[PDB]
Design a protein around this nucleic acid. Structure first.
Lengths: 276, 67, 77, 80, 203
RNA sequence: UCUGAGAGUUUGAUCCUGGCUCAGGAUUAACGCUGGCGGCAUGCCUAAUACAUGCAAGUCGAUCGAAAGUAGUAAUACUUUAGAGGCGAACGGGUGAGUAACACGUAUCCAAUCUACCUUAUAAUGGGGGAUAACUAGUUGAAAGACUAGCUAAUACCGCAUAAGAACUUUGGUUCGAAUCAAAGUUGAAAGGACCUGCAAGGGUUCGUUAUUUGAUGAGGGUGCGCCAUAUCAGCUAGUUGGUGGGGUAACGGCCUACCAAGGCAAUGACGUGUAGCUAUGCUGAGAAGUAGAAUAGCCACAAUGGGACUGAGACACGGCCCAUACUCCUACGGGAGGCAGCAGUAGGGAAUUUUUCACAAUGAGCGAAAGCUUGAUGGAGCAAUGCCGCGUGAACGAUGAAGGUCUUUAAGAUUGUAAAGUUCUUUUAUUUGGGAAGAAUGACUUUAGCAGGUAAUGGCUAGAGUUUGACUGUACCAUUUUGAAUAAGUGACGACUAACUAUGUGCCAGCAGUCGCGGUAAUACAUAGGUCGCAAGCGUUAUCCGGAUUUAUUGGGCGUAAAGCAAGCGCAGGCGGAUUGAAAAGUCUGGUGUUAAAGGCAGCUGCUUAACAGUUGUAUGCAUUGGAAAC
């Protein structure tokens, strides 16, 4: 939604660049300027509808992480990807949150070759191929029980908390808490904090930072003091017990097993069965 | 950028340290540190953020906290 | 590229040829006066000097100086 | 002219065609604001004739500004 | 800036109610103590030249509604003339447009006068004023357009307006005229400007 | 008078010498967090690194022949110019690489030089000749181009005549290396165009041109004076110093040359090295002065480097030539285009320096009697909170203060907090309606009125009427135009220095920080919540400069114990120097004149509603001259 100023037109001939001024219905050229145009954009002068297309292509998506070597070259490579994305809107680049590095996709080996040539010639940034990364979610296996203690004197006053948490993993049902404290071993005011004490800590994994998912946590016993023993003691004890449970349980990893529809003509079918 | 090499202090809790990053510099003076009267800017292309911070948003380059 | 530049270049090539011709016509009569120090040679030299001064090939001060040098020699005779 | 943008202030000066714009000037005639519809030039009309008689003709835009004052009516007859 | 937030906050803290006893009125509490969580008996020993100069300057620029940069700018403008710079500077301050409007009672507050001027409802000598920064001379007239006099609020303010002998008001025609420089007793005596003058060490 | 601020930091405690940091203004600033506008300025100091493309000097047919095409039977009318020739090109544009001295700043002397066109009027614009592009043909040729022979005109070139006037020489005369003037010897100027009138002859209006001749103007040359550091740089210099003769650039000058020589500068510091555009000016303080020499205005020079010559009036010439040098590009490989410190813009650098922008609307420039052509000079617009000014982001009423929070954390309460809940009002802005600028009043074009040597003619001068004159911009701005609190705030800090504090965590771990100095157990010094204070579409932050710092001291310090008397004597140059008498007036003080650019500062005033900004009047200081004074 802006008016672009067409500065000059030019036709790239076999060897020469013929600078022309007028273009009629049937001829094609290029414009100097409009340095922020993206392929697929339509140009309008006499208030006509835009013929912008968005459903004419298919995704060749194959994720491949590209490991960086020098941070300055990585910073320039980010700008290079920004300047090459408009070249092919169907060219895909992901930015993994756990590993903030570029994830190239393409249509095969020659696709990667042309992309790396584009990076290494115009931008002069050359990067070596690494290896892709996967989310690799986490669960674990049942454990007996976990204790948690927190005693301090810092600040001229102590802070005290004792909790017993039994940490139950699942495969389908996410985070859920059940309370079983009876007998005044904890005041009700610190019931809801512990409800938030566990789940907030549940998103940390003891292998590579992958959040722990589909777990059930429960409280059985606990201990506190007189007017001391403020709210944060049990909140931090819950997280400490969660981390200890996740560490000593020898956790298990999960990866998505993608359903693959291999469509082939009636020539490589038996070969497809053999290859699989 | 010059052939000389300079000692600086890394402000705040936490670190963005990889011993390989080009980073900018800041002035100031810290007399406790022997030989260190130069500083690294926190909140630039490197040393990008300090978390939990909601004050002193002139150093540490932390985005303004809003709900 | 400047069209006036090349235009003036092709013009002053010919102008330089003509100026060199007139300068040599001057100098050969100056040599003739150096050989024959008489009134006729001085008159020819001063005529040619005026001809160059008419168009402006030789500045009036330069012409006056050279004619003073020559007339001094003639007066010594 | 000089001054801030959207405020044309052209000080009236005698100009020899060899000098650059608003550079070292021979002698300032006066001051005039084209925006105001009122004669405001500070001219003595005596030194102006001095510059006219010594050559180096100033801008033509002020010649009309001197026809209203009758400078020509006396200049052309003082020429004789 | 131009807005100080709650007006009662400044009045309670600095002990200066712009209205005699309305900005520190019994509005749920009647106290002269500074506001905040530390309301308690304290020993005032830092009250000195630094503290008093800051207090007078802040009260000056908050009652006048002028930002610090503009305040020093007007001080420098006063510096160009000669004489007793304190009293003359205060007179130049009092010749501010919104202050004159407030003294006429045509606007309840200087901020209300600023709103009236900026929205463009004040006419000065064949020129409508849009910037609430105008210095009036003796014999300078202020008009309110027929469009801007239809409001019950402005009429109520006019009927309960401030009286000022140094200027002439025609309430039946909504006309104002800056007659003369206000005398010393006609100026607010709350603030002593000499300390603020000594606060200028930029010379 | 312009006009003056300090505090802390050594000790058990006290004072003194000194240092350090803070307290404030400014940027050719930038970073970090945010982010509304109007007005205005500013926006590569690094790589004078390399740089694609468009512009950055073009113009003249009333200069010329000819060439082509639209009409016309042809003739001729109509449109353009490829070339020659003419003017212009050396100025504008941009940088500070280099330049340490008449480069810069300033006054004279040029009896040492010139200046096309502008200003001064006068003699004249006489008669001939030859070629020459353009054009054609042939050759080398892919073109690019180059070579060869004919064809053509000129305000293009070349003889001759007239040359009052001019240059040169001689005789006389003026005056203190030169002046004015009488006669004589000698020398040399060109071209017509266009228009009108007239049968013609001829005459007239303007332009083009030569000669002569007034200023103004630019450039060049000499001059005293001041105009960076540096002695941990004592000799430097060979056309150098000077003379005779000659030649030479506008001139005098070893400027150059033939001959004869021996000095010249030089401890009042030359020479050497580093650095460097300078000045007016920007900032700082009252000032001595320091700071920076953004833009700007002038001066200075190169244009990738080292050189050279030509045209031209002026160039060794931003985008002229040639040569040598480093590179790109094309090449058919034979050879060629060459050089964005012009407007831009990009590769890279850095903190960073921008549209690959409009029109020449206006001024100017270049040119042409002209319609007028070009103009990335010039004036606007775009981006960026880089900076300054203004401006909103609401206002009135509404509580022993709603809710919640924070705190004593009692079953008082305070606190946020007229903030709010909520009711009215209100539109700069968000938003449609209408209206709509000043800026040509620049000039020219067409008509008329008067003017003049001339009037036989139109042109030359002044007036009046109509024609048009914008890139800007339906912009600014205005009018109950409509709806509307709605459309817009973050920032730093609270132990003290220096106004602004309490709670939780914290255990010398984290971390704070400009200093004193804080934190190894109730931390007002840290991290967070709340409160509070100060600024604000900006806040902090660093770099850097002036003040404080008089803390390199004529103004403005000392040398016995905090730093400091050569170990003493002799002593040059130089500095300082008794009085009386006389003179002079060099310093000194004063009167007058001219210069010391504009802009800037200071004071007064004017306008864009108003600050910012622009403009007007007065306004120092120094220089030289004239005249006074003799107290030193």
């Amino acid at each position: 939604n802006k008016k672009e100023r067409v500065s000059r037109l030019v036709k790239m001939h076999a060897q020469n660049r013929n600078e022309i001024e007028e273009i009629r219905a049937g001829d094609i050229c290029a414009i100097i300027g409009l340095k922020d145009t993206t392929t697929g954009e339509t140009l309008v002068d006499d208030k006509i509808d835009v013929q912008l297309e968005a459903m004419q292509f298919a995704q060749p998506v194959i994720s491949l992480a590209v490991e960086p070597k020098t941070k300055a070259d990585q910073e320039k490579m980010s700008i290079a990807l920004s300047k090459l994305a408009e070249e092919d809107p169907t060219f895909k680049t992901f930015t993994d949150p756990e590993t903030g590095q570029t994830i190239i996709a393409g249509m095969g080996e020659l696709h990667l070759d042309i992309l790396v040539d584009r990076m290494r010639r115009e931008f002069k940034v050359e990067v070596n191929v690494g290896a892709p990364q996967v989310s690799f979610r986490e669960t674990f296996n049942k454990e007996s029980e976990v204790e948690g203690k927190y005693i301090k004197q810092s600040g001229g006053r102590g802070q005290y908390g004792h909790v017993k948490i039994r940490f139950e993993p699942n495969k389908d049902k996410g985070f859920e808490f059940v309370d079983k404290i009876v007998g005044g071993r904890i005041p009700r005011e610190y019931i809801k904090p512990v409800q938030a004490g566990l789940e907030n800590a549940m998103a940390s994994g003891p292998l590579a930072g992958y959040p722990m998912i589909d777990i059930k946590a429960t409280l059985f016993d606990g201990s506190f003091h007189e007017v001391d023993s403020s709210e944060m003691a049990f909140k931090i004890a819950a997280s400490l017990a969660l981390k200890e449970a996740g560490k000593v349980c020898s956790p298990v990893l999960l990866e998505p097993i993608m359903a693959i529809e291999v469509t082939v003509p009636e020539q490589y079918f038996g070969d497809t069965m053999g290859d699989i | 950028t010059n052939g000389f090499e300079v000692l600086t202090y890394i402000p705040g809790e936490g670190h963005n340290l990889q011993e390989h990053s080009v980073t900018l510099l800041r002035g100031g003076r810290v007399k406790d540190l022997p030989g260190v009267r130069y500083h690294i800017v926190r909140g630039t292309l490197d040393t990008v953020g300090v978390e939990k911070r909601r004050q002193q948003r002139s150093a540490y380059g932390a985005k303004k906290p809003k709900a | 590229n400047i069209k006036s530049n090349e235009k003036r270049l092709r013009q002053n090539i010919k102008r330089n040829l003509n100026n060199k011709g007139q300068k040599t016509k001057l100098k050969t009569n100056v040599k003739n006066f150096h050989k024959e120090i008489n009134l006729d040679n001085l008159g020819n030299v001063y005529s040619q000097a005026d001809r160059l001064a008419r168009k402006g090939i030789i500045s009036t001060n330069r012409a006056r100086r050279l004619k003073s040098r020559n007339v001094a020699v003639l007066n010594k005779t | 002219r000089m001054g801030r943008v959207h405020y044309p202030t052209y000080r009236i000066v005698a100009v020899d065609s060899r000098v650059k714009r608003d550079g070292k000037y021979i002698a300032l005639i006066g001051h005039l604001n084209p925006a105001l519809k009122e004669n405001k030039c500070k001219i003595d009309e005596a030194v102006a004739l001095e510059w006219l008689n010594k050559g180096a003709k100033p801008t033509d835009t002020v010649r009309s500004l001197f026809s209203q004052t009758g400078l020509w009516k006396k200049f052309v007859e003082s020429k004789k | 800036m131009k807005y100080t937030g709650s007006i009662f906050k400044r009045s309670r803290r600095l002990g200066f109610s712009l209205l005699e006893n309305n900005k520190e009125f019994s509005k749920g509490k009647k106290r002269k103590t500074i506001p905040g969580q530390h309301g308690n008996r304290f020993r005032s020993s830092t009250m000195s030249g630094y503290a008093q100069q800051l207090q007078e300057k802040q009260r000056m620029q908050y009652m006048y509604g002028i930002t610090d940069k503009q305040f020093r700018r007007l001080f420098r403008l006063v510096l160009k003339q000669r004489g007793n710079l304190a009293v003359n500077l205060f007179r130049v301050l009092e010749s501010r447009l919104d202050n004159i409007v407030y003294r006429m009672g045509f606007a309840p507050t200087r901020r209300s006068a600023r709103q009236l001027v900026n929205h463009g409802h004040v006419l000065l000598n064949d020129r409508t004023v849009d910037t609430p920064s105008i210095i009036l001379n003796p014999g300078d007239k202020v008009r309110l357009k027929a469009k801007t006099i239809k409001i019950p609020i402005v009429k109520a303010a006019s009927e309960s307006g401030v009286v000022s002998p140094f200027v002439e008001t025609n309430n039946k025609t909504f006309e104002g005229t800056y007659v003369r420089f206000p005398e010393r007793s006609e100026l607010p005596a709350g603030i002593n400007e000499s300390y603020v003058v000594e606060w200028y060490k930029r010379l």
